[PDB]
Ligand binder design. Structure first.
Ligand SMILES: *[C@H](O)Cc1ccccc1
Ligand SMILES: *[C@H](O)Cc1ccccc1
Lengths: 359, 122, 121, 361
């Protein structure tokens, strides 16, 4: 026998999920673990140094990471980068230099995103002044710094436009940025106030439809941003809660805590009872399933202490993640059905993502 | 009041995530990491910036402003990890937010530990 | 035949530290890491050097030379850690010794996982 | 009201300090040294050591020496093997000394990273995989050269009765002695007669080190010695650790840094386990045996607490043992050790603990 390298991941792209392991206890050795959701098999990994973030290219061909190096880890010159990796060979291809202010923080989806057309990576900076950085993937260059987004946070791509995204601002409204084909800002707009920052703060995680996004609040309200037109129209609140729910102080909690099943309009939200100040990141006691058209709950199931989720539209799946274990659910019908749990998928993960299949 | 002076308290009390001033810590308490509530462990560097919290002191009944400064430039301490969230808000209220590394602007941004510095009455 | 071809055998058997050819592994089994007993997980690089074990095959009753080549250039796999020491010797018999990183001569020496390559009888 | 400050020194005095080298094998690129107070189990601080760090304290107790490997992008880019000099009281980085890119990467046996008795040279093991010993002039901050004469040998045993001499164990079953000049180059060398059969009675590399002799235990529970009181090393052994009852239950040594010598009494400490056979030489200790090296008799046996590595302090008459995660502190001023306390959770994956030096001139 002879040991060989150069091999590709053994399972098809459509089976693959990406568990971003912060390894917070040893945060300089964060990594992405690649699993097959159909059988729980470990398929490989991508090292991501200090507090890595990850996404898969919309065309499914590449993995993008964002990380920070120093010449001697704990001393020496800093290099913030995006790396491009081949998705099948799990090999490094290209480093793209960033200014030394890429967001260091927990793995909310909205900190490291891409345009719908896949041509630009859109990432959050904090120095601690905030701005949004644009990377041209083809050119391998940082091409734009959106200072218009100062005082805003996170990136919500618009799936109905090729190079548009929104961010949540300190006024409780949204800033929309439309990039040109060069990755520079081509236009922008600001919505009216959607939510009261002080009185009903929203979680940043969107329940994202093709042409609208829903957001849940610390107190269990729902707000929406409709981007069917060039100007975003905002609305809300409606309550997730009926009177019985209110009596037991049910509120949302988690990190990447919501999801939307686009074909049905069902929104999935992690909820826990006995809500009060300081419980907004509590593990889920339940997952609630909301009909966003009727603005009413349709189902509730045990939450398995989950903190983060993600949805696959085309296979009608939901993953949930409790920090270490990934639960796989069929959401083809209104009540989710638990298919399996992948134990020990990470030591400290708050983000799981499917390999894109939609092109 | 004695409740304002952690160096005079029992170490087990201050090293607990339930200690009143640790009400918005996301990190390893520096007092468990070879430092104290207001001193970085040897060879780690204070952060010039921080998230800020308002914490209730049940011992004197008053509310205090706390600045959560990190110590930086050494790898994760790993001891006394807390994830408390009283009055913590998302990144659109950036200086109330604790899911970001408040070592981010240090000469070396590697996160070592966190602490809770008493600013004054809220 | 079957005892010499782990790709055809039961994966739960091959992914165990008690599998006969893993008799001097100090590391993570590559077959638990997205690879197989003789292939590196994607994006990790074989080591050209190794420590060697002599392991007893309980199926055919014969002893075989196993070359423990590492896969390198990715951070620790962390799965299926073994620390078996049959016929292992200290560093003064260097190529029988498994407390050194056999990735030490690779372009990138970061240790990912250990493979158990069958050399022969 | 308050202000967070840095620049502080370790809170407990040097004589209270121990160093637990945490390989963090699960995340080996973030290895580190954990500094503890052995008198009360308090965590005092840490030194980051990147990929598979090794550590020692300067003989004069002022500095911590680490040895590690960096790459420009960790898993890719140019390699830098280094020794780093850190201030012991401030736990701050002072100086990097460049090494050739072949410093030993491996588990934390003491003999892979040592220093001359006079403290002037760091003496470290290289493997490319060809082996050689590297010499570092600490004050100059220079790598002197490779001791290529040590090819086919392994590990460094300083001679405590000479300023800049050490031995290494060779594949012929003998010892090579290297004597350095004031510049750190080899001034002379000598090779002993065969001490042990590499094939039939391999020894553990960890020495039970006296001022002018070293003892070694074997896979089968024999003891060998190398006496360096004269100008050439005189070798001897085996004598057996085992009596008939011991042999009948197949007691053998096992562990990593598995032996120690209390120099004033001649007591040798060894981790042992029953049902020994091929493959059990790194098993955790079922017991610690205490041997009188003069009488060649066992004088005590106590529970092993699954320990794998130990260290002895001659100045306070102490033994630490370490099971990978927990450190046990023993008083060894009498033949039977007395357990004082256990420091739980000192490391995730450590095979080496060391005292901060006190005295020792
Ligand atoms: C303390 O600074 C919070 C934190 C969050 C994410 C990464 C590192 C530190
Ligand atoms: C497998 O190469 C053994 C090993 C030992 C010590 C460090 C890293 C790997």
């Amino acid at each position: 026998e002879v040991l060989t390298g150069g091999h590709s991941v053994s399972a098809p792209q459509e089976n693959r999920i990406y568990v971003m392991d912060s390894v917070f206890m040893h945060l300089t050795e964060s990594r992405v673990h690649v699993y097959d959701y159909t059988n729980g098999k470990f398929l490989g990994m991508v090292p991501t140094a200090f507090n890595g973030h990850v996404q898969v290219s919309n065309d499914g061909k590449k993995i993008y990471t964002m990380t920070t190096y120093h010449e001697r880890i704990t001393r020496g010159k800093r290099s913030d980068v995006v790396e491009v990796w081949d998705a099948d060979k799990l090999t490094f291809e290209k480093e793209i230099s960033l200014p030394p202010k890429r967001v260091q923080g927990l793995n909310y989806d909205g900190l490291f995103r891409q345009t719908t057309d896949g041509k630009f990576i859109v990432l959050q900076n904090a120095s601690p002044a905030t701005s949004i950085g644009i990377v041209d993937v083809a050119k391998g260059d940082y091409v734009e710094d959106v200072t218009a987004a100062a005082g805003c946070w996170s990136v919500i791509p618009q799936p109905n436009r090729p190079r548009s995204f929104m961010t949540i601002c300190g006024d409780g409204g949204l800033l929309t940025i439309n990039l040109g084909e060069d990755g520079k800002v081509a236009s922008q707009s600001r919505s009216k106030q959607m939510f009261s920052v002080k009185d009903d703060p929203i979680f940043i995680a969107p329940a994202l439809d093709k042409d609208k996004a829903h957001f849940v609040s610390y107190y269990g309200n729902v707000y929406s941003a409709d981007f069917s037109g060039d100007e975003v129209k905002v609305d809300g609140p409606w309550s997730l809660l009926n009177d019985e729910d209110k009596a037991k102080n049910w509120v949302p909690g988690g990190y990447n805590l919501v999801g939307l099943h686009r074909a049905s309009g069902r929104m999935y939200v992690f909820m826990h009872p006995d809500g009060k100040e300081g419980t907004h990141k509590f593990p889920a006691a339940e997952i609630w399933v909301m009909d966003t058209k009727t603005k009413q709950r349709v189902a509730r199931i045990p939450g398995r202490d989950a903190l983060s989720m993600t949805i696959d539209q085309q296979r009608n799946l939901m993953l949930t993640l409790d920090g270490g274990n990934v639960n796989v659910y069929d959401i083809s019908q209104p009540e989710p059905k638990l298919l399996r749990t992948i134990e020990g998928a990470a030591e400290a993960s708050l983000q799981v993502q499917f390999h894109p299949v939609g092109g | 009041h004695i409740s304002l002076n952690p160096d005079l308290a029992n170490e087990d009390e201050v090293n607990s995530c339930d200690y009143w001033r640790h009400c918005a810590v996301d990190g390893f308490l520096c007092s468990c990491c070879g430092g104290t509530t207001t001193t970085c462990p040897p060879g780690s560097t204070p952060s010039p910036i921080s998230w800020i919290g308002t914490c209730h002191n049940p011992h004197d009944g008053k509310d205090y402003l706390i600045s959560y400064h990190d110590c930086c430039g050494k790898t994760a301490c790993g001891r006394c990890q807390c994830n408390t969230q009283t009055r913590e808000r998302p990144g659109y209220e950036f200086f109330l937010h604790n899911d970001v590394n408040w070592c981010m602007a240090n000469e070396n941004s590697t996160f070592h530990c966190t602490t809770s510095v008493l600013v004054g009455l809220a």
